[PDB]
RNA sequence: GCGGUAAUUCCAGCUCCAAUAGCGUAUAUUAAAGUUGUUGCAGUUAAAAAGCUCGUAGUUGAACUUUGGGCCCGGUUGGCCG
RNA sequence: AGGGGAUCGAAGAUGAUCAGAUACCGUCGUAGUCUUAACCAUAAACUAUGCCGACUAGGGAUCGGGUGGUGUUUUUUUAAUGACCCACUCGGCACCUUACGAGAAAUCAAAGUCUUUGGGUUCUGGGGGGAGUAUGGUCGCAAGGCUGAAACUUAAAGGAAUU
RNA sequence: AUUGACCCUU
């Protein structure tokens, strides 16, 4: 039967959505169906912070960060534990943790 | 709604639609096409005479086991070959 | 020895309520079958069928028995009970209790000319349970109960004499068939008719009038 | 209803909702019978004398119980400035 | 107190404690404070009460 | 688009009565609608109804009571004779003692009872009970 | 609500409703007499005027069409009819 | 057998029948 | 039908205004609530304290119409109304259910807390959905202290009051108790018997 | 609605209830009539005649101020067009679309829309030919339509 | 579905049951079949909504024109009345 | 059939893995992937939900238009406009809640107003296979598309749920 | 990283 009212994606009023490639397996998956997550990370791994700061030329350097958007196919997201299988009643929870 | 027309002058549509759809019925199609007279072995008849040819020990389906013989028969009016079952215990000795 | 624990049960034991008609009139929810058999002592209980139902476990299948019993007086009152138990005797007895608890009144009417006593139903009714839809149609006198042996017995316990039935869905499901027929006969008093259009003075409930002589 | 010679038959003529004029079933266990006391010129209500309303479980489920009771009470005159016919 | 346990002494100490009170009361009135809508509601009621009418902007 | 204005009106009445409302609005108020409502009125199934005159087609506001169980429309308006009166009134009426099949006869719009009394038949419009 | 007066609704409710959804549908628009400074020229102008209405006197474009109501000029005085 | 592969197999059978028939005729 | 002495007295109007019962729910509004009048800016609505008042008096009339004082039950699962309903049940019969309403207290006749009320007065229908849902099984009429966003389902006599405001909840419960006692006639406090009872602290919720 | 789209829009004129209107109109029926005639001679279809009348003059409806509608005035006074204005505008739109398509062969959307517009033209033409305001055997042709417009 | 060494189903004996000068079997057809559906089926997932739109035949198609008030007479009823 | 031909890459090459591995994995790589002209006419072409119309619950959000608020940013802290904020309104893509109801259920504000059965209309289905096959027709360069059986065979296939 | 299979009826 119909597992989800949304068919496991986000497409109402479109028909077609251009695909993206999974960042792990490079599988084509419609952009609305992907498990895109925005990863914003410090460059210095939060463990070399003091070492880099004390070895820097400038005092109170800003320490820029890196941004990327990771697009995930359903298989790769489940395997990498980006998402997990939930119970039937709380699959409907749209709210992020 | 409900599909079918509800016009007071739509009876031709209704009759034609029923005629078209009745062909989905197994017995109606068979009767109207005359498959009995054309391709049934008995030719539409309840009974038929024939002549016994040889010995066919049909093996039963599952879960079952019974393999002696069933008569292959050539029909008189058709010449068609037909397997027939001998319907009782030891009655194979009368249909040699 | 009954010893009820209910306002309504204590009232019925005390004898302030004499007819099941007051209970039906004031929609009091009965919960003790002693009430039902005290107000309708003449009802006959008889089982429609008993079937086995199995629940699978890591060690075999645990089998219980589900009994469908129908309680019905001579005229106007029936109830239907379905109960599953480990033993057939327990299933039968508990189904009898549930059927008594679920007793409803029947609006028996005339096909026409209102000469004798009401012999049929007042209006065409219908009940549904699962895919089974049971439709009851008033029939002229002497017609009998044109119904399958399952709901025919239920109608006989209701007290109707002449009635037609029309069944739809998979009617071999006896439980759903009997429940749909029970709904059909129940809706007869819910169908409003011109002879019922008259307004009524809205009397007081038995619990309210005899609240002083209750447990409180 | 009756038979040919009168003789009231069809046991248990039933009650109807005061707001929708529809029958209350024998096992309509969501319906209510509201009793409102009357006050006799002294700030004290008459015991044993009340105005009664039968209210259907359908109305209560739909939630129009309060509006229907307001309208009936004002119609009976025991409410003054609550319910307005012209919404 | 320990939830789940309740005895006569506990009930008595509850009533004694909620009948006893520190004597200080520092909430003396400054007279009440209603908006335009509430003030005109009281006018529609037709009562005579002392109120200060201040509109609370959106 | 709008095929049976009477069917629309009767469906609106059915919906309002089932949902429990004591009044219903009907657009656009045909003459057959007026006659049907008059028949239901004189049988006491609706109560009062008021015709609002907007210069286009008119509207009706029908004050309902709880007495209406089901009013409906038979489409198409089948040609029905005296012999078929019984067939209809048995097919689509809950009982033989109340409820009416309404039909346009050459003597105007009436129920099957008055059609029998005046010995007229015609085309079946609908029913009420 | 189960019971309400559809024949006599409140003025506020009917003003809130869409123009075609009222009991008897009526136009929410209106006519106004616009006079420009200088030439009196009391001239009736539709509120939704879809045009650059100008009086014959001089360069007196009165209203400039918009999506809904016509926007009037800067120096101009209007009176609802 | 997957329905798509059964469909492909039936297509191959159909074209082989077509070729044999065209050879015989 | 009233003897024209039950209309809103100015002192009671001051009480309600100070307790802020009139400060109803936000721009969220159930359509089954015509008690709103002149919605204030910022989105807060002003509850028409007049209709609040005669709805309270009507609920008291029903409570007085009920014969046995100890079949009526008053329910509060909210923290504000627990002591209010406890004092209500100490002032009249009106047996209390504060804290947790165990399911099957109206059904489940073998339950220790099995009550068979002829009226339930609920502090908040949303918090006490269980008591209302159980009343809908046993034919118990429902009075409820309802805001402008309250679930008016299965409640017969609403009382439009601020259920967000603890002062308003306590005041409404006190007014219910006072009016039922006055109607029953045990409270002979008409104008000036023993009189001064603004004397003590209404305000101790915890 | 929207015979040739999926739109369900309700948007139209709320004609006033009153027919003897509008109690602020001091001009005369003859003055409005000669305004109709002047605009028609200037070469304006009844749609824009009514627009400018309601819009610059005070004319709530020419129908209610006069005894009849603008197309009736024009036909009574000899100013009725050879073909009705709605069909004329449909033909003009079809000519514009076809002219666009000839250059843009690749415009499949334009081809689809031309099909729709010409279907509307043929339906309107059939109605007009039935009510006889257009002569029988009148037929819309793409080759002659551009010259027919002007 | 029965029968693989303890067969209430085979082959028999005894007993019993149904119809009975009749009973069984084969085929066809009717009811059951609301499994042909006008009454009166179904089409999200069980079979089944054309990929989508245009469009002729066909089917269907908003409201409106004379409505309402006064006197008698064949003919029916628990008939005012035994 | 021209052009284009970076990348990826049915076929193929090749290295692993493997009992085998003409598979998954790895590195290449023709056709193709892009385009012009002409064909094809299929997809789980799906919302597996035909279109037109009417009515039936509550709620918030959102997109387009409009209407009313000397409500907030600067010209101008002293009309405008804009962008926001409120209250509606019409029309969309949807969503949350509940069951008046419907349903076999999953679930559905439509899959409701359908044994209290009729608003208009088009198409389709009648147990599972054989079979989308054979044959005839027609379209296509072809691949194939549309139309489309029967003999024969079979008691289950199938749906939704429960432990 | 590899993990194929396990007769009929009951």
- Which of left, alpha, beta for D43 (phi over 0: left; psi -120 to 50: alpha)? left
The CA–C1' separation of G18 and L88, in angstroms, is 9
CB D51 within 8 A of CB D38: yes
Residues F120 and F62 reside in one and the same domain: no
Report the distance separating Cα F128 and Cα D73, nearest Å: 32
Contacts 24+ apart (CB under 8 A), B50-58: B50/B74, B50/B75, B50/B76, B50/B82, B50/B84, B51/B76, B52/B95, B52/B96, B53/B81, B56/B83, B58/B83, B58/B85
Name the domain boundary from C55, C75, C104: C104
Query: Counting Cβ atoms within 10 Å, is residue B31 exposed (0-12), middle (13-18) or buried (19+)?
Result: exposed
Residue (of C27, A21, C14) closest to I137 by Cα position:
C27
Q: How many angstroms separate the CA of F71 from the C1' of L113?
A: 12
G13 vs G9: CA distance, rounded Å? 7
* C1’ L132 / CA B21, Å: 19
3-state DSSP of C152-195: HHHHHHHCCCCEEEEEECCCCCHHHHHHHHHHHHHHHHCCCCHH
CB G46 within 8 A of CB J55: yes
Considering the domain boundaries, does residue I4 fall inside one?
no
The sheet with strand F59-63 has its strands ordered as F23-26, F59-63, F48-52
Query: What total of structural domains would you count in chain B?
Result: 1
Can you read off the two tokens belonging to residue D32? 């209510």
Q: How many CB atoms lie within 10 A of CB J44?
A: 19
> Could you tell me which of I146, I142, I138 has the C-alpha nearest to residue I156?
I142
Whether B6 and F78 lie within 8 Å, measured CB to CB? no
Phi, psi of F39 (to 5 degrees): -65, -45
Q: Which secondary structure element, helix H or strand E, spans residue H11, and what is its range?
A: helix H3-24
CA–CA separation, C125 and E37 (whole Å)? 56
Q: Is the CB of B63 under 7 A from strand M?
A: yes
In whole angstroms, what separates CA D19 from the centre of its chain?
A: 7
The CA distance from I120 to I131, in Å, is 8
Nearest to I23 by CA among I1, I52, I62, I3: I52
Any domain includes I5: no
Are residues F40 and F73 located together in one domain of the fold?
A: no
Determine whether H9 is exposed, middle or buried from the number of CB atoms within 10 Å of its CB (0-12, 13-18, 19+).
exposed
| Mode of pairing for the β-strands spanning B50-56 and B70-75 | antiparallel
Cα A92 to Cα B14: distance, rounded to the nearest angstrom? 47
Query: Domain range for residue C115?
Result: 108-196
CB C105 within 8 A of CB C24: yes
The helix (H) or strand (E) run that includes residue C120 is: strand C120-121
Distance from C-alpha of C203 to C-alpha of C191, rounded to nearest angstrom: 21
Decide the pairing of beta strands C163-168 and C145-146: parallel
Judgement on whether residues F20 and F48 belong to the same structural domain of the protein = yes
In terms of Cβ atoms closer than 10 Å to its own Cβ (0-12, 13-18, 19+), residue F92 is: middle
Residue G76 sits at the vertex; the CA angle it makes with G72 and G77, to the nearest 5 degrees, is 100
- Determine the Cα–Cα distance for residues C15 and C22; give it in Å rounded to an integer: 12
d(CA I158, CA I150): 10
Residues 6+ apart with CB under 8 A from F93: F99, F100, F101, F127, F129
* List of residues 6+ apart from B21 with CB closer than 8 A: none
Pairing of strands C44-56, C61-72: antiparallel
Q: Are residues C192 and C162 in the same domain?
A: yes
Tokens of C103: 């007793």
Of C99, C151, C140, nearest to C116 by C-alpha is: C140
Query: What kind and span of H or E run contains F109?
Result: strand F108-111
Closest CA to J57 of G38, G67, G33: G33
Domains of chain D: 1-87 (3.30.1230.20)
Q: How far apart are the first and last CA of chain D?
A: 39
Chain D hits for F20, CB-CB cut-off 8 Å, are 19-20, 22, 58-59, 62, 64
Number of domains in chain F: 2
Rounded CA gap, E42 and E13, in Å? 44
B vs C contact (3+ beta-carbon pairs below 8 A): no
Of the partner residues J1, J17, J19, the one whose CB lies closest to the CB of residue F54 = J17
- Find the domain containing B96 and state its range: 1-96
First to last CA, chain E: 46
Counting beta carbons within 10 angstroms of the beta carbon of residue C138, is it exposed (0 to 12), middle (13 to 18) or buried (19 or more)? buried
Long-range interactions of I32-36: CB distance < 8 A, separation 24+? I32/D63, I32/D64, I32/D66, I32/D67, I32/G1, I32/I152, I33/I146, I33/I148, I33/I150, I33/I152, I33/I158, I33/I160, I34/D67, I34/D84, I34/D87, I35/I148, I35/I160, I36/I148
The count of other CB atoms within 10 Å of the CB of residue C174 is 17
Name the residue facing C112 among F66, F69, F96 (closest C-beta): F96
**Can you read off the two tokens belonging to residue E20?**
């006893």
Q: Rounded CA gap, G74 and G52, in Å?
A: 14
Are chains G and H in contact at 3+ CB pairs closer than 8 Å? no
Alpha-carbon distance A24 to F127, whole Å? Answer: 68
CA I154 – CA D56 distance, rounded (Å): 10
Backbone φ, ψ for residue D69 (5° rounding): -65, -40
Burial environment of residue A9 by CB neighbours within 10 A (0 to 12, 13 to 18, 19 or more): middle
The alpha carbon of J59 is separated from its chain's Cα centroid by a whole number of angstroms, namely 19
CA I104/CA I115 separation, integer angstroms: 9
In a domain, C33, yes or no: yes
Beta-carbon neighbour count of residue J87 at 10 Å? Answer: 21
Q: Are residues F105 and F45 in the same domain?
A: no
Strand-pairing partners, residue B52, are B73
Give the contacts of J136 (CB within 8 A, at least 6 positions apart). Answer: J129
In order, the DSSP letters of I33-54 are: -TTEESPPGGGPPEE-HHHHHH
Cα distance between residue J146 and residue C161, in whole Å:
83
Q: Could you write out the DSSP letters of every residue in E19-49?
A: H---S---------EE-HHHHHHHHHHT---
Beta-bridge partner residues of G25:
none
Experimental method, per PDB record: cryo-EM
C24 and C92 co-located in one domain: yes
**Cβ contact (<8 Å) for D67 and G5?**
no
Which residues, 6 or more positions from C44, have their beta carbon under 8 angstroms from its beta carbon? C71, C72, C73, C157
Are F51 and F103 within one domain? Answer: no
CATH of the domain at C49: 3.30.160.20
Q: How far apart are CA G79 and CA G44, in angstroms?
A: 9
What domain range is F112 assigned to? 69-129
- How many Cβ atoms sit within 10 Å of the Cβ of residue C107? 24
User: Which tokens belong to C119?
Assistant: 């012999």
Q: Single out the residue of C117, C138, C127 nearest to residue C193, CA to CA.
A: C138
| Same domain, yes or no: C28 and C79 | yes
Q: What is the resolution of this structure in A?
A: 2.7
CB atoms within 10 A of CB F69: 19
Residue A23 region by backbone torsions, left for phi larger than 0, else alpha for psi between -120 and 50, else beta: alpha
Is there a single domain that holds both residue F59 and residue F77? no
Q: Which residue's structure tokens are 């006491």? A: F44
Contact indicator for C121, C160 with CB cutoff of 8 Å = yes
d(CA I61, CA I5): 14
Closest residue on chain F to G24 (Cα): F54
- Are C87 and C114 part of one and the same domain? no
H-type helices in I66-163, by residue range? 81-91, 129-138
Backbone CA torsion sign across B13, B14, B18, B19: negative
The answer to whether residues F7 and F56 belong to one domain is yes
Nearest CA in chain D to G13: D87
Distance (Å, whole) CA B58 – CA B70 = 6
Give the H or E element holding residue H14: helix H3-24
H or E element: which one contains D74? helix D65-76
The three-class DSSP label of residue B75 is strand
Please provide the DSSP assignment of G12-51 as one string: HHHHHS-GGGSSS------EEEEE-SSS---EEEESS--S
Task: Label residues I154-181 b or e (16+ Cβ within 10 Å = b).
Answer: bbbbbbbbbbbbbbbbbbbbbbbbbbbb
Same domain, C15 and C99: yes
Cβ–Cβ below 8 Å for F78 and B8: yes
Q: In terms of domains, do F77 and F122 share one?
A: yes
Q: Is I97 within a domain? A: yes
Regarding whether F88 and F63 lie in a shared domain, the answer is no
Instruction: Give the total residue count for chain B.
Output: 96
Q: Report the C-alpha gap between G7 and G25 in whole angstroms.
A: 13
**Element (DSSP H or E) covering residue J87:** helix J85-103
> Which one-letter DSSP state was computed for residue F70?
-
For residue C185, the domain's CATH number is 3.30.230.10
Domain carrying residue I101? 12-206
Tell me phi and psi for residue A79, to 5 degrees: -65, -45
Q: Which two tokens stand for residue B65?
A: 């086991």
Pick from F68, F102, F119: which residue ends a domain?
F68
Dihedral of the alpha carbons of D20, D26, D27, D30, in degrees to the nearest 10: 30
* Total domains in the fold of chain C: 2
Q: Hey, what's the torsion of the CAs at J132, J137, J138, J140, to 10 degrees?
A: 130
Instruction: Give the residue among A20, A40, A18, A38 at the shortest CA–CA distance from A28.
Output: A20
The 3-state secondary structure of chain A, one letter per residue: CCCCCCCCCCCCCCCCCCEEECCCCCCEEEHHHCCCEEEEEECCCCCCHHHHHHHCCCCCCCCCEEEEEECCCHHHHHHCCCCCCCCCHHHHCCCCC
DSSP three-state, residue J109 = helix
Do C13 and C54 have their domain in common?
yes
d(CA D38, CA A34): 68
Non-local (6+) Cβ contacts of B27 within 8 A are none
Judge whether C207 lies within some domain: no
Could you identify the residue written with the tokens 């992020």? A96
Judged by DSSP in three states, J142 sits in helix
Q: Do F106 and F54 belong together in one domain?
A: no
3-state helix, strand, coil in chain C (%, to 5): 30, 30, 40
Q: How far apart are CA A68 and CA C192, in angstroms?
A: 69
Which of C22, C211, C215 is the best substitution to test chain I (most I C-beta atoms within 10 A)?
C211
- Chains touching F (at least 3 CB pairs under 8 A) are B, C, D, G, J
- Rounded distance between C-alpha atoms, residue I134 and residue D38, angstroms: 29
Q: Which residues of G fall below an 8 Å CB-CB distance to F?
A: 2-4, 6-7, 23-25
Name the residue among I163, I161, I123, I129 with its Cα closest to residue I143: I123
Q: Which of residues 90-119 of J touch strand K (CB under 7 A)?
A: 112, 115-116, 119
> Is F46 found in the same domain as F61?
yes
- Residue F125's SS3 state is strand
Does residue D65 contact residue I156 with C-beta atoms inside 8 Å? yes
- Quickly list DSSP for B76-95: TTT--EEEE---STTGGGG-
C54 touches strand K (CB under 7 A): no
Q: Do residue C118 and residue C73 come from a single domain?
A: no
Number of separate domains in chain I: 1
Task: Characterize the bridge pairing of strands I95-98 and I73-76.
Answer: parallel
Distance from CA of C118 to the nearest CA of D (A): 8
Instruction: Evaluate whether J116 touches J124 at the Cβ level (below 8 Å).
Output: no
Please state whether the peptide bond connecting residue A12 to the residue before it is cis, i.e. omega within 30 degrees of 0: no
Residues 6 or more apart in contact with residue I3 via CB below 8 angstroms: D39, D41, D42, D43
Are C44 and C157 within 8 A, CB to CB? yes
Do C21 and C100 belong to one domain? yes
Nearest to J40 by CA among J29, J53, J30, J59: J53
Residue A33 CB: number of other CB atoms within 10 A? 20
Determine the Cα–Cα distance for residues B15 and G31; give it in Å rounded to an integer: 61
């Amino acid at each position: 039967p119909k597992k989800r009212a949304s068919n496991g994606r986000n497409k109402k009023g479109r028909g077609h959505v251009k695909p993206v490639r999974c960042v792990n397996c490079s599988k084509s998956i419609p952009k609305d169906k992907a498990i895109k997550r925005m990863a914003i990370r410090n460059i210095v791994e939060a463990a070399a912070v003091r070492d880099l700061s004390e070895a820097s030329v400038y005092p109170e350097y800003a320490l820029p960060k890196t941004y990327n958007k990771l697009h995930y196919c359903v298989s790769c997201a489940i395997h990498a534990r980006i998402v997990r299988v939930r119970s039937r009643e709380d699959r409907k929870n749209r709210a992020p943790p | 709604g409900k599909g079918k027309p509800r016009g007071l002058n739509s009876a031709r549509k209704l009759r034609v639609h029923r005629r078209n759809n009745r062909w989905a019925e197994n017995n109606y199609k068979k009767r109207l096409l005359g498959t009995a007279f054309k391709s049934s072995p008995f030719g539409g008849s309840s009974h038929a005479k024939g002549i016994v040819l040889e010995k066919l020990g049909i093996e039963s389906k599952q879960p079952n086991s019974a393999i002696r013989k069933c008569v292959r028969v050539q029909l008189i009016k058709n010449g068609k070959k037909v397997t027939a079952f001998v319907p009782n215990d030891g009655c194979l000795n009368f249909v040699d | 020895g009954w010893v009820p624990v209910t306002k309504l049960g204590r009232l019925v034991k005390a004898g302030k309520i004499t007819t099941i008609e007051e209970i039906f009139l004031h929609s009091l929810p009965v919960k003790e079958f002693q009430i039902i058999d005290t107000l309708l002592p003449g009802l006959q209980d008889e089982v429609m069928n008993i079937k086995p139902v199995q629940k699978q476990t890591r060690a075999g299948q645990r089998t219980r028995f589900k009994a469908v019993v129908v309680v019905g007086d001579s005229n106007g009152h029936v109830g239907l009970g379905i109960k599953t138990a480990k033993e057939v005797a327990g299933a039968i007895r508990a189904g009898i209790i549930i059927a008594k608890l679920s007793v409803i009144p029947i609006r028996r009417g005339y096909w026409g000319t209102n000469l004798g006593q009401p012999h049929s139903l007042a209006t065409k009714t219908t009940g549904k349970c699962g895919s089974v839809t049971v439709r009851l149609i008033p029939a002229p006198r002497g017609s009998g109960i044109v119904a399958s042996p399952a709901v025919k017995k239920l109608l006989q316990l209701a007290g109707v004499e002449d009635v037609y039935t029309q069944s739809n869905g998979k009617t071999r499901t006896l439980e759903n068939t009997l429940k749909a027929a029970f709904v059909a006969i129940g809706n007869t008093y819910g169908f409003l008719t011109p002879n019922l259009w008259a307004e009524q003075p809205l009397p007081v409930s038995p619990l309210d009038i005899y609240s002083d002589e209750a447990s409180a | 209803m009756e038979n040919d010679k009168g003789q009231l038959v069809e046991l248990y003529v039933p009650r109807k909702c005061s707001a929708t004029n529809r029958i209350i079933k024998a096992d309509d266990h969501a319906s209510v019978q509201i009793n409102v006391a009357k006050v006799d010129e002294e700030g004290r209500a008459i015991p044993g004398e009340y105005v009664t309303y039968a209210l259907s479980g359908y109305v209560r489920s739909r939630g129009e119980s309060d509006d229907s009771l307001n309208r009936l009470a004002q119609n009976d005159g025991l409410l003054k400035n609550v319910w307005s016919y012209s919404r | 107190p320990v939830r789940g346990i309740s005895f006569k002494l506990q009930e008595e100490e509850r009533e004694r404690k909620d009948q006893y009170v520190p004597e200080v009361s520092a909430l003396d009135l400054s007279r009440l404070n209603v908006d335009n809508q509430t003030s005109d509601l009281v006018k529609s009621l037709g009562l005579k009460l002392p109120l200060s009418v201040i509109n609370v902007s959106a | 688009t709008r095929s049976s204005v009477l069917a629309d009106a009767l469906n609106a009445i059915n919906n309002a009565e089932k949902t429990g409302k004591r009044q219903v609005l009907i657009r656009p108020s045909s003459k057959v609608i007026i006659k049907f409502l008059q028949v239901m009125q004189k049988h006491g199934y609706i109560g009062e109804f008021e015709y609002i005159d907007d210069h286009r087609s008119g509207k009706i506001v029908v004050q309902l009571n709880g007495r209406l169980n089901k009013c409906g429309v038979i489409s198409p308006r089948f040609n029905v004779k005296i012999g078929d009166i019984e067939k209809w009134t048995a097919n689509l009426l809950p009982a033989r003692q109340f409820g009416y099949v309404i039909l346009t006869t050459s003597a105007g719009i009436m129920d099957h009872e008055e059609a029998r009394r005046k010995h007229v038949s015609g085309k079946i419009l609908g029913f009420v009970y | 609500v189960l019971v309400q007066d559809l024949l006599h609704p409140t003025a506020a409710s009917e003003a809130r409703k869409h123009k075609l959804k009222t009991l008897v549908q009526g136009p929410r628009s209106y006519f106004l007499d616009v006079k420009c400074p200088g030439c009196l020229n009391i001239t009736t102008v539709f509120s939704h005027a879809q045009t650059a209405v100008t009086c014959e006197s001089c360069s007196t474009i009165l209203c400039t069409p918009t999506g809904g109501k016509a926007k009037l000029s800067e120096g101009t005085s209007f009176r609802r009819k | 057998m997957r329905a798509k592969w059964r469909k492909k197999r039936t297509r191959r059978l159909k074209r082989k029948r077509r070729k044999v028939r065209a050879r015989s005729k | 039908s009233l003897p024209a002495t039950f209309d809103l007295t100015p002192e009671d109007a001051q009480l309600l205004l100070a307790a802020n019962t009139h400060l109803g729910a936000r721009n969220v509004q159930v359509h089954q609530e015509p008690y709103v009048f002149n919605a204030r800016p910022d989105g807060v609505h002003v509850i028409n304290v007049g209709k609040t008042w005669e709805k309270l008096v009507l609920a008291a009339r029903i409570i007085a119409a009920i014969p046995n004082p100890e079949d009526v039950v008053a329910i509060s699962s909210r923290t504000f109304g627990q002591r209010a309903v406890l004092k209500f049940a100490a002032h009249t019969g009106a047996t209390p259910i504060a804290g947790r309403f165990t399911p099957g207290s109206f059904t489940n006749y073998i339950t220790r807390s099995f009550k068979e009320p002829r009226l339930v007065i609920v502090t908040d229908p949303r918090s006490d959905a269980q008591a209302i849902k159980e009343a809908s099984y046993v034919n118990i009429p429902v009075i409820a202290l309802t805001d402008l966003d309250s679930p008016s389902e299965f409640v017969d006599v609403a009382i439009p009051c601020n259920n967000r405001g603890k002062h308003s909840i306590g005041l409404i419960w006190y007014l219910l108790a006072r009016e039922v006692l006055r109607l029953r006639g045990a409270l002979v406090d008409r104008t000036q018997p023993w009189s001064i009872m603004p004397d003590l602290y209404f305000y101790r919720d915890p | 609605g929207r015979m040739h789209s999926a739109g369900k829009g309700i948007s139209s004129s709320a004609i006033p209830y009153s027919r003897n209107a509008p109690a602020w109109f001091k001009l005369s029926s003859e003055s409005v009539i000669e305004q109709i005639v002047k605009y028609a001679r200037k070469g304006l279809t009844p749609s824009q005649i009514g627009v400018l009348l309601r819009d610059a003059h005070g004319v709530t409806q020419a129908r209610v101020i006069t005894g009849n509608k603008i197309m009736r005035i024009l036909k009574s006074n000899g100013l009725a067009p050879e073909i009705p204005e709605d069909l004329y505008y449909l033909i003009k739109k079809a000519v514009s679309v076809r002219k666009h398509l000839e250059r843009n062969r690749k415009d499949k959307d334009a081809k689809f829309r031309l099909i729709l517009i010409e279907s509307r033209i043929h339906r309107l033409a059939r109605y007009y030919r039935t009510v006889a305001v257009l002569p029988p055997n009148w037929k819309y042709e793409s080759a002659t339509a551009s010259a027919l417009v002007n």
